[PDB]
Amino acid sequence: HSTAETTLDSFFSRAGLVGEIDLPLEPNGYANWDIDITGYAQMRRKVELFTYMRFDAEFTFVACTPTGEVVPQLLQYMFVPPGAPKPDSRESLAWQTATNPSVFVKLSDPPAQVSVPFMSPASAYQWFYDGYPTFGEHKQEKDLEYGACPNNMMGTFSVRTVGTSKSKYPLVVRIYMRMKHVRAWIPRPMRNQNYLFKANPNYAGNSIKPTGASRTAITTL
Amino acid sequence: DRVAQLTIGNSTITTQEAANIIVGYGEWPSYCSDSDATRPDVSVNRFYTLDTKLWEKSSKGWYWKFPDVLTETGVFGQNAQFHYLYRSGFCIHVQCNASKFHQGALLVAVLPEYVIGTVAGGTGTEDSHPPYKQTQPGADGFELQHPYVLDAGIPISQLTVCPHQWINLRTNNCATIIVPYINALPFDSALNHCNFGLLVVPISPLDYDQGATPVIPITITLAPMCSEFAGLRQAV
Amino acid sequence: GFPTELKPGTNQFLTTDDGVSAPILPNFHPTPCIHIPGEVRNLLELCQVETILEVNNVPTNATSLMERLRFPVSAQAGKGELCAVFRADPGRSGPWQSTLLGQLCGYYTQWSGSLEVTFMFTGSFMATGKMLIAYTPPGGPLPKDRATAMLGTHVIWDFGLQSSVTLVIPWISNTTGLVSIWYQTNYVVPIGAPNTAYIIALAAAQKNFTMQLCKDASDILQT
Amino acid sequence: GFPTELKPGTNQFLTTDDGVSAPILPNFHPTPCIHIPGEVRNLLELCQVETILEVNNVPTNATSLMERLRFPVSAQAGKGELCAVFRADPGRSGPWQSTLLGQLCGYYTQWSGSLEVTFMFTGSFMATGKMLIAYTPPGGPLPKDRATAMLGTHVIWDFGLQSSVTLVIPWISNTTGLVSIWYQTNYVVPIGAPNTAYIIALAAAQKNFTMQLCKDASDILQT
Amino acid sequence: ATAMLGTHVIWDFGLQSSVTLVIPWISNTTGLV
């Protein structure tokens, strides 16, 4: 008898590849990674199994060249909390603001990892908010502020190379994320049809397909 | 099993308790006594009896969305526009009446946070979002288009994981569900955050031989429980 | 100056380690855990739930797609003929793939446990008749006729008396068992009753059901 | 030979960890902690302080800048017409930005709590009159007329008897609430009293006020 | 929908056949059923 494998903290607490940031030689010299628990293109399905969830999460950063080659560069990883401004450009005050935490690592150093607490004003995340956010906007043309609850925004990640003078080495930063202390709530039935958009559960009505495989008749094998 | 005489406030239903009686989430609706981080009893707790939607042989289903269903209808509907904060539970009681010579099971089930989605198409467009008249249908409700995916890529095959009650005219012709307050916040605007959406989906289609009234109604009767409001706005 | 020598495996990054790492904001107090109904702590709590078992398999094309949850049961052709049969393993693809169970097992590998299969009849109050449900263990194939099926573990099912019959699948672990449904009797239709009625099948796992190994399945996601 | 393995994340420099590091001067005893009056240990003790609420917003040019702290109250035109209104969210920009509350909130993000708004009258001792102060919750707009304003939560405020009236704002958390002041009555000015009088509004946070997330606002600094 | 709001009785046939409505008070439009 062993039922730990069927626990949530055993069902999510695995570091997945979430963010892939390109820092070439010859895009603009910085990057901003809006945190989205997707990217790891299956956790999406694994998450909408529930409606209300809550978790703390640890991020880990593996950085290298496209070669995999290791170079002595000194990076700056910066967490930009919700509401706080994102870096407008390479030398905006957003790197120095210090409210937004920063991580300074070399690549000769082992992968930098950091923990991030649960950051919603609400008691839990929602994967479904059937209705419109506080408060209701009128004036027509609009039909875009739906099923989107900005209370679930976890903030953003930004990287440098660093400035001021440009790097010499093309770099890629592999971003890994793992959940902890998970607590979900009211359970949803799992998706059956292909996704189309993020932050919206539309589907292809022209091409509806059965949930599972099918046979020719019931009486045959 | 014969007789039925139930009355509250002003409204009056006539049901019974001879088969399956009550399904709750496992938790009766209640109040709250914290720092938040009016309780009407002599008007709200009355059976709002909705409009009986018909059911043809070739129907696909219907679904209402709480609390939109009543927000523009009833004394309750009134003190929802004027107040801004909302919290309640519900005593949904779905009752269909038909002969013994009919057949066709129904699935009364409540799906909390029913975010819907329509088909992309029409003209060659790729992206679109559902109008207000499909997310907040009101008392009349809304005939869904694609049952199998609940207009949300959500298989009905697994819907029973959520609170549900079967209506099989062979055995039972009545349904009663009790729904508690379900939210990430202890209070929300009743107007722009419709919580759970009730839906009635037919699996075994209604059938009959020749000449037998092909249309049996579905009387949906519901009543709020442990309703709660706070601050209020001005009147017209 | 507490002396240490670095045991091999240093600097390594493991995607599964249950390590605790430095926090971005030590001075940050999250929104307190409020109580919300329907908290789930383990997936087994879902496997115990009556879910629909897609037995009928015909997507022709999508209008009739909803006929996947139902059986056909009529007077015709008549007695004794096989009504419907299906596999007895959730992991397999997949008339079971309708259930939450089948899908959840799709996120795992190894199974073990008993299964409940609940059938509900959806015909008139007047129509009667009896049908035979027989379970067949892994070894041995579909028994050719009811007479042979009766000998095995089986359930004689009536309509007129009861409408809900629960079949208990005793045990499964790693052909993988078979369940056959038989017209024991005719299909009686008084006078105005429809000659053909439909059946919904519900399935669920027993309380002793377990999974063991995490694994991820197949979904798609475009731009 | 104590076995250790470097859990990943070593050598990193994080701008927020509360780790303890080596001291420059180990043999040094700093100047001892003497007692100084008015010690502050938490910023909330500042948010509980009544500060001046800039409601009037007219910088014409810097000379009239002091007219931001005051209300206009005169005899004409008279009853029922709107005197003054303002928002009910410190974070928003920003008649509240005068308050200590308003600026501190510029150094944070999330708010929660009730607020006190105290009005002070500055007219003659003989002059009287009454005015209606009504709070309007987020949803719903500026009440059209006093008649509509009375129906909501409101305070009938007289002059002749008392000069300080306190308004209790029930709740704020993240339209955004409204506070409306109305000429319920005319303004009586005996004989030598000025036809026009002015009001000071004082604001502060209630004891249940809390912030949650640090953030920095806009300042500049030259050579 | 508007009629429901007033004092009303949902009456079924199949279960019960006799339902009594009580007119509260009358004394000297003049009430309606």
PDB file of C-alpha atoms in Angstrom, chain A:
ATOM      1  CA  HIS A   1       0.000   0.000   0.000  1.00  0.00           C
ATOM      2  CA  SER A   2       1.345   3.358  -1.159  1.00  0.00           C
ATOM      3  CA  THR A   3      -0.734   6.397  -2.106  1.00  0.00           C
ATOM      4  CA  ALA A   4       1.848   9.198  -2.146  1.00  0.00           C
ATOM      5  CA  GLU A   5       2.246   9.006  -5.920  1.00  0.00           C
ATOM      6  CA  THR A   6      -1.361  10.042  -6.189  1.00  0.00           C
ATOM      7  CA  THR A   7      -0.780  13.153  -4.098  1.00  0.00           C
ATOM      8  CA  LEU A   8      -0.747  16.646  -5.572  1.00  0.00           C
ATOM      9  CA  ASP A   9       2.733  17.473  -4.282  1.00  0.00           C
ATOM     10  CA  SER A  10       3.897  14.320  -6.060  1.00  0.00           C
ATOM     11  CA  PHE A  11       1.815  15.257  -9.081  1.00  0.00           C
ATOM     12  CA  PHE A  12       3.283  18.701  -9.708  1.00  0.00           C
ATOM     13  CA  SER A  13       6.591  19.009  -7.836  1.00  0.00           C
ATOM     14  CA  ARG A  14       8.768  18.294 -10.837  1.00  0.00           C
ATOM     15  CA  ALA A  15      11.020  20.899 -12.404  1.00  0.00           C
ATOM     16  CA  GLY A  16       9.804  21.513 -15.930  1.00  0.00           C
ATOM     17  CA  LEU A  17      11.263  23.535 -18.780  1.00  0.00           C
ATOM     18  CA  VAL A  18       9.188  26.708 -18.870  1.00  0.00           C
ATOM     19  CA  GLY A  19      11.213  29.525 -20.405  1.00  0.00           C
ATOM     20  CA  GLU A  20      13.583  29.653 -23.354  1.00  0.00           C
ATOM     21  CA  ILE A  21      15.270  33.036 -23.740  1.00  0.00           C
ATOM     22  CA  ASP A  22      17.460  33.867 -26.715  1.00  0.00           C
ATOM     23  CA  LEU A  23      20.328  36.322 -26.282  1.00  0.00           C
ATOM     24  CA  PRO A  24      22.054  36.507 -29.691  1.00  0.00           C
ATOM     25  CA  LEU A  25      25.083  38.486 -30.836  1.00  0.00           C
ATOM     26  CA  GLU A  26      23.487  39.923 -33.972  1.00  0.00           C
ATOM     27  CA  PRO A  27      17.453  40.472 -29.751  1.00  0.00           C
ATOM     28  CA  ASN A  28      17.630  44.034 -28.380  1.00  0.00           C
ATOM     29  CA  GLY A  29      19.966  43.155 -25.508  1.00  0.00           C
ATOM     30  CA  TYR A  30      17.413  42.286 -22.853  1.00  0.00           C
ATOM     31  CA  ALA A  31      14.369  40.099 -22.338  1.00  0.00           C
ATOM     32  CA  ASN A  32      11.225  40.084 -20.239  1.00  0.00           C
ATOM     33  CA  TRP A  33       9.608  36.770 -19.447  1.00  0.00           C
ATOM     34  CA  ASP A  34       5.992  37.146 -18.407  1.00  0.00           C
ATOM     35  CA  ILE A  35       5.606  34.242 -16.005  1.00  0.00           C
ATOM     36  CA  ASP A  36       3.088  31.693 -17.267  1.00  0.00           C
ATOM     37  CA  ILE A  37       2.788  28.208 -15.783  1.00  0.00           C
ATOM     38  CA  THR A  38       2.265  26.941 -19.329  1.00  0.00           C
ATOM     39  CA  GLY A  39       5.291  26.771 -21.646  1.00  0.00           C
ATOM     40  CA  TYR A  40       5.850  23.314 -20.224  1.00  0.00           C
ATOM     41  CA  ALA A  41       3.236  22.321 -22.766  1.00  0.00           C
ATOM     42  CA  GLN A  42       1.306  19.716 -20.778  1.00  0.00           C
ATOM     43  CA  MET A  43       1.051  21.222 -17.298  1.00  0.00           C
ATOM     44  CA  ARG A  44      -1.624  23.284 -19.010  1.00  0.00           C
ATOM     45  CA  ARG A  45      -3.853  20.224 -19.227  1.00  0.00           C
ATOM     46  CA  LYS A  46      -2.671  19.037 -15.801  1.00  0.00           C
ATOM     47  CA  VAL A  47      -3.669  22.321 -14.181  1.00  0.00           C
ATOM     48  CA  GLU A  48      -7.159  22.901 -15.582  1.00  0.00           C
ATOM     49  CA  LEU A  49      -8.068  19.607 -13.927  1.00  0.00           C
ATOM     50  CA  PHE A  50      -8.847  21.853 -10.967  1.00  0.00           C
ATOM     51  CA  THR A  51     -10.435  25.303 -10.793  1.00  0.00           C
ATOM     52  CA  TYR A  52      -8.939  27.002  -7.765  1.00  0.00           C
ATOM     53  CA  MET A  53      -5.292  26.336  -6.952  1.00  0.00           C
ATOM     54  CA  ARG A  54      -2.534  27.746  -4.773  1.00  0.00           C
ATOM     55  CA  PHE A  55       1.186  27.021  -4.652  1.00  0.00           C
ATOM     56  CA  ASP A  56       4.626  28.405  -3.967  1.00  0.00           C
ATOM     57  CA  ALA A  57       7.227  27.794  -6.675  1.00  0.00           C
ATOM     58  CA  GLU A  58      10.994  27.533  -7.105  1.00  0.00           C
ATOM     59  CA  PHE A  59      12.606  28.744 -10.327  1.00  0.00           C
ATOM     60  CA  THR A  60      15.998  27.546 -11.558  1.00  0.00           C
ATOM     61  CA  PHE A  61      18.097  29.060 -14.348  1.00  0.00           C
ATOM     62  CA  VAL A  62      20.386  27.061 -16.622  1.00  0.00           C
ATOM     63  CA  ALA A  63      22.283  29.332 -19.003  1.00  0.00           C
ATOM     64  CA  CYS A  64      24.613  28.416 -21.859  1.00  0.00           C
ATOM     65  CA  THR A  65      25.494  29.006 -25.498  1.00  0.00           C
ATOM     66  CA  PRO A  66      23.469  27.264 -28.208  1.00  0.00           C
ATOM     67  CA  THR A  67      26.573  25.099 -28.410  1.00  0.00           C
ATOM     68  CA  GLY A  68      26.152  24.182 -24.771  1.00  0.00           C
ATOM     69  CA  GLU A  69      29.588  25.723 -24.522  1.00  0.00           C
ATOM     70  CA  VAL A  70      30.285  27.316 -21.135  1.00  0.00           C
ATOM     71  CA  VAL A  71      31.482  30.922 -20.993  1.00  0.00           C
ATOM     72  CA  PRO A  72      32.580  33.181 -18.103  1.00  0.00           C
ATOM     73  CA  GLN A  73      29.876  35.816 -18.399  1.00  0.00           C
ATOM     74  CA  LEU A  74      28.196  37.477 -15.437  1.00  0.00           C
ATOM     75  CA  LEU A  75      24.429  37.557 -15.752  1.00  0.00           C
ATOM     76  CA  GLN A  76      21.705  39.423 -13.913  1.00  0.00           C
ATOM     77  CA  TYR A  77      18.365  37.737 -13.357  1.00  0.00           C
ATOM     78  CA  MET A  78      15.665  40.073 -12.132  1.00  0.00           C
ATOM     79  CA  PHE A  79      12.262  39.288 -10.712  1.00  0.00           C
ATOM     80  CA  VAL A  80       9.748  41.989 -11.530  1.00  0.00           C
ATOM     81  CA  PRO A  81       6.722  41.693  -9.192  1.00  0.00           C
ATOM     82  CA  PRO A  82       3.138  42.420 -10.377  1.00  0.00           C
ATOM     83  CA  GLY A  83       2.128  46.048 -10.891  1.00  0.00           C
ATOM     84  CA  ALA A  84       5.763  47.109 -10.809  1.00  0.00           C
ATOM     85  CA  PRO A  85       7.094  48.437 -14.111  1.00  0.00           C
ATOM     86  CA  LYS A  86       8.778  46.186 -16.647  1.00  0.00           C
ATOM     87  CA  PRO A  87      12.104  47.235 -18.150  1.00  0.00           C
ATOM     88  CA  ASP A  88      11.314  49.703 -20.937  1.00  0.00           C
ATOM     89  CA  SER A  89      14.778  49.276 -22.399  1.00  0.00           C
ATOM     90  CA  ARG A  90      18.291  48.081 -21.611  1.00  0.00           C
ATOM     91  CA  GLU A  91      19.304  50.961 -19.353  1.00  0.00           C
ATOM     92  CA  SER A  92      15.985  52.055 -17.867  1.00  0.00           C
ATOM     93  CA  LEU A  93      15.839  52.473 -14.091  1.00  0.00           C
ATOM     94  CA  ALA A  94      14.168  49.061 -13.856  1.00  0.00           C
ATOM     95  CA  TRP A  95      17.484  47.274 -13.210  1.00  0.00           C
ATOM     96  CA  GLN A  96      18.363  49.539 -10.310  1.00  0.00           C
ATOM     97  CA  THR A  97      14.889  49.881  -8.773  1.00  0.00           C
ATOM     98  CA  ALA A  98      15.891  47.239  -6.194  1.00  0.00           C
ATOM     99  CA  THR A  99      12.245  46.682  -5.282  1.00  0.00           C
ATOM    100  CA  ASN A 100      12.411  44.176  -8.096  1.00  0.00           C
ATOM    101  CA  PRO A 101      14.861  41.559  -6.759  1.00  0.00           C
ATOM    102  CA  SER A 102      17.977  40.710  -8.762  1.00  0.00           C
ATOM    103  CA  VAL A 103      20.215  37.648  -9.142  1.00  0.00           C
ATOM    104  CA  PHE A 104      23.841  38.067 -10.216  1.00  0.00           C
ATOM    105  CA  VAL A 105      25.469  34.839 -11.387  1.00  0.00           C
ATOM    106  CA  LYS A 106      28.289  33.718 -13.612  1.00  0.00           C
ATOM    107  CA  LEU A 107      27.916  30.674 -15.840  1.00  0.00           C
ATOM    108  CA  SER A 108      30.994  29.016 -14.385  1.00  0.00           C
ATOM    109  CA  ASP A 109      28.856  29.063 -11.256  1.00  0.00           C
ATOM    110  CA  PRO A 110      26.218  26.300 -11.055  1.00  0.00           C
ATOM    111  CA  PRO A 111      22.597  27.072 -12.123  1.00  0.00           C
ATOM    112  CA  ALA A 112      20.937  29.804 -10.072  1.00  0.00           C
ATOM    113  CA  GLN A 113      17.711  28.803  -8.353  1.00  0.00           C
ATOM    114  CA  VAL A 114      15.229  30.940  -6.434  1.00  0.00           C
ATOM    115  CA  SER A 115      11.934  30.413  -4.610  1.00  0.00           C
ATOM    116  CA  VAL A 116       8.849  32.527  -5.266  1.00  0.00           C
ATOM    117  CA  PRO A 117       5.943  32.734  -2.823  1.00  0.00           C
ATOM    118  CA  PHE A 118       2.257  32.766  -3.831  1.00  0.00           C
ATOM    119  CA  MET A 119       1.546  36.263  -5.130  1.00  0.00           C
ATOM    120  CA  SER A 120      -2.206  36.765  -5.565  1.00  0.00           C
ATOM    121  CA  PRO A 121      -4.407  39.130  -3.533  1.00  0.00           C
ATOM    122  CA  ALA A 122      -7.038  36.409  -3.774  1.00  0.00           C
ATOM    123  CA  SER A 123      -6.865  33.293  -1.607  1.00  0.00           C
ATOM    124  CA  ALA A 124      -6.023  31.168  -4.628  1.00  0.00           C
ATOM    125  CA  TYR A 125      -5.364  31.166  -8.354  1.00  0.00           C
ATOM    126  CA  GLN A 126      -8.273  30.660 -10.713  1.00  0.00           C
ATOM    127  CA  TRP A 127      -8.075  28.958 -14.068  1.00  0.00           C
ATOM    128  CA  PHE A 128     -11.632  30.028 -14.770  1.00  0.00           C
ATOM    129  CA  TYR A 129     -13.353  33.330 -13.981  1.00  0.00           C
ATOM    130  CA  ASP A 130     -16.714  33.145 -15.744  1.00  0.00           C
ATOM    131  CA  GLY A 131     -17.544  36.833 -15.820  1.00  0.00           C
ATOM    132  CA  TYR A 132     -15.799  40.185 -16.022  1.00  0.00           C
ATOM    133  CA  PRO A 133     -13.207  41.620 -13.587  1.00  0.00           C
ATOM    134  CA  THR A 134     -13.856  44.376 -11.038  1.00  0.00           C
ATOM    135  CA  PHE A 135     -14.994  46.497 -12.446  1.00  0.00           C
ATOM    136  CA  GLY A 136     -17.246  46.232 -15.495  1.00  0.00           C
ATOM    137  CA  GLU A 137     -16.208  48.170 -18.574  1.00  0.00           C
ATOM    138  CA  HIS A 138     -18.826  49.220 -21.101  1.00  0.00           C
ATOM    139  CA  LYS A 139     -18.416  51.187 -24.355  1.00  0.00           C
ATOM    140  CA  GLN A 140     -18.761  48.625 -27.168  1.00  0.00           C
ATOM    141  CA  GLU A 141     -16.191  47.286 -29.682  1.00  0.00           C
ATOM    142  CA  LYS A 142     -14.715  45.729 -26.524  1.00  0.00           C
ATOM    143  CA  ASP A 143     -15.004  41.960 -26.138  1.00  0.00           C
ATOM    144  CA  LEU A 144     -11.539  41.158 -24.820  1.00  0.00           C
ATOM    145  CA  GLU A 145     -11.597  41.535 -21.026  1.00  0.00           C
ATOM    146  CA  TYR A 146     -13.179  38.117 -20.504  1.00  0.00           C
ATOM    147  CA  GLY A 147     -12.126  35.046 -18.547  1.00  0.00           C
ATOM    148  CA  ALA A 148      -8.972  36.963 -17.723  1.00  0.00           C
ATOM    149  CA  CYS A 149      -8.360  37.601 -14.037  1.00  0.00           C
ATOM    150  CA  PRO A 150      -5.167  39.694 -13.629  1.00  0.00           C
ATOM    151  CA  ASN A 151      -5.140  38.664  -9.972  1.00  0.00           C
ATOM    152  CA  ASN A 152      -3.260  35.553 -11.140  1.00  0.00           C
ATOM    153  CA  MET A 153      -0.322  37.431 -12.650  1.00  0.00           C
ATOM    154  CA  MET A 154       2.833  36.175 -10.966  1.00  0.00           C
ATOM    155  CA  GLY A 155       5.140  38.907 -12.204  1.00  0.00           C
ATOM    156  CA  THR A 156       7.877  38.854 -14.830  1.00  0.00           C
ATOM    157  CA  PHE A 157      11.493  37.739 -15.248  1.00  0.00           C
ATOM    158  CA  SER A 158      14.156  39.854 -16.918  1.00  0.00           C
ATOM    159  CA  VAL A 159      17.740  39.055 -17.939  1.00  0.00           C
ATOM    160  CA  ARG A 160      20.826  41.028 -18.939  1.00  0.00           C
ATOM    161  CA  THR A 161      24.210  40.086 -20.346  1.00  0.00           C
ATOM    162  CA  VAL A 162      25.231  42.492 -18.686  1.00  0.00           C
ATOM    163  CA  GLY A 163      25.632  46.096 -19.836  1.00  0.00           C
ATOM    164  CA  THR A 164      26.901  48.521 -20.589  1.00  0.00           C
ATOM    165  CA  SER A 165      29.122  47.253 -23.384  1.00  0.00           C
ATOM    166  CA  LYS A 166      27.662  44.332 -25.319  1.00  0.00           C
ATOM    167  CA  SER A 167      28.577  40.711 -24.629  1.00  0.00           C
ATOM    168  CA  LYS A 168      30.736  38.603 -26.915  1.00  0.00           C
ATOM    169  CA  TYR A 169      28.983  35.294 -26.418  1.00  0.00           C
ATOM    170  CA  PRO A 170      25.588  34.279 -27.796  1.00  0.00           C
ATOM    171  CA  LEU A 171      23.596  32.923 -24.863  1.00  0.00           C
ATOM    172  CA  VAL A 172      20.452  30.937 -24.182  1.00  0.00           C
ATOM    173  CA  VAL A 173      18.869  30.745 -20.749  1.00  0.00           C
ATOM    174  CA  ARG A 174      16.912  27.597 -20.021  1.00  0.00           C
ATOM    175  CA  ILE A 175      14.289  28.334 -17.362  1.00  0.00           C
ATOM    176  CA  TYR A 176      13.125  25.585 -15.012  1.00  0.00           C
ATOM    177  CA  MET A 177      10.185  25.774 -12.599  1.00  0.00           C
ATOM    178  CA  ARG A 178       8.857  23.447  -9.903  1.00  0.00           C
ATOM    179  CA  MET A 179       5.840  23.747  -7.587  1.00  0.00           C
ATOM    180  CA  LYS A 180       5.620  23.330  -3.806  1.00  0.00           C
ATOM    181  CA  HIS A 181       2.996  23.356  -1.039  1.00  0.00           C
ATOM    182  CA  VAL A 182       0.235  22.824  -3.578  1.00  0.00           C
ATOM    183  CA  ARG A 183      -3.416  22.970  -2.598  1.00  0.00           C
ATOM    184  CA  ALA A 184      -6.079  22.708  -5.274  1.00  0.00           C
ATOM    185  CA  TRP A 185      -9.824  22.917  -4.914  1.00  0.00           C
ATOM    186  CA  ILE A 186     -13.025  22.137  -6.836  1.00  0.00           C
ATOM    187  CA  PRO A 187     -12.169  19.630  -9.620  1.00  0.00           C
ATOM    188  CA  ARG A 188     -12.753  20.149 -13.328  1.00  0.00           C
ATOM    189  CA  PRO A 189     -13.251  17.421 -15.922  1.00  0.00           C
ATOM    190  CA  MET A 190     -10.113  17.149 -18.069  1.00  0.00           C
ATOM    191  CA  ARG A 191      -9.927  18.707 -21.532  1.00  0.00           C
ATOM    192  CA  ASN A 192     -10.845  16.518 -24.517  1.00  0.00           C
ATOM    193  CA  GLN A 193     -10.389  18.880 -27.447  1.00  0.00           C
ATOM    194  CA  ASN A 194      -7.313  20.726 -28.677  1.00  0.00           C
ATOM    195  CA  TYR A 195      -6.365  24.091 -27.190  1.00  0.00           C
ATOM    196  CA  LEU A 196      -6.417  27.157 -29.399  1.00  0.00           C
ATOM    197  CA  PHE A 197      -5.557  30.139 -27.250  1.00  0.00           C
ATOM    198  CA  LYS A 198      -3.824  30.745 -23.955  1.00  0.00           C
ATOM    199  CA  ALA A 199      -6.000  32.444 -21.334  1.00  0.00           C
ATOM    200  CA  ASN A 200      -9.033  31.327 -23.360  1.00  0.00           C
ATOM    201  CA  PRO A 201     -10.663  27.882 -23.759  1.00  0.00           C
ATOM    202  CA  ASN A 202     -12.032  28.231 -27.308  1.00  0.00           C
ATOM    203  CA  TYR A 203     -12.071  25.153 -29.546  1.00  0.00           C
ATOM    204  CA  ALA A 204     -12.373  24.178 -33.203  1.00  0.00           C
ATOM    205  CA  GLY A 205     -16.076  23.608 -33.802  1.00  0.00           C
ATOM    206  CA  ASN A 206     -15.478  22.766 -37.443  1.00  0.00           C
ATOM    207  CA  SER A 207     -13.332  19.841 -36.345  1.00  0.00           C
ATOM    208  CA  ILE A 208     -14.725  18.205 -33.211  1.00  0.00           C
ATOM    209  CA  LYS A 209     -13.107  14.868 -32.414  1.00  0.00           C
ATOM    210  CA  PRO A 210     -14.025  12.080 -29.978  1.00  0.00           C
ATOM    211  CA  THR A 211     -12.348  12.033 -26.552  1.00  0.00           C
ATOM    212  CA  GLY A 212     -10.672   8.661 -27.018  1.00  0.00           C
ATOM    213  CA  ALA A 213     -10.093   6.120 -29.776  1.00  0.00           C
ATOM    214  CA  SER A 214     -13.005   4.380 -31.487  1.00  0.00           C
ATOM    215  CA  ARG A 215     -14.032   1.019 -32.945  1.00  0.00           C
ATOM    216  CA  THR A 216     -16.184  -0.200 -35.849  1.00  0.00           C
ATOM    217  CA  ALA A 217     -18.970  -1.588 -33.664  1.00  0.00           C
ATOM    218  CA  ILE A 218     -19.505  -2.408 -29.992  1.00  0.00           C
ATOM    219  CA  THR A 219     -19.678  -6.185 -30.341  1.00  0.00           C
ATOM    220  CA  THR A 220     -16.217  -6.517 -31.880  1.00  0.00           C
ATOM    221  CA  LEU A 221     -12.694  -6.273 -30.475  1.00  0.00           C
TER     222      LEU A 221
END
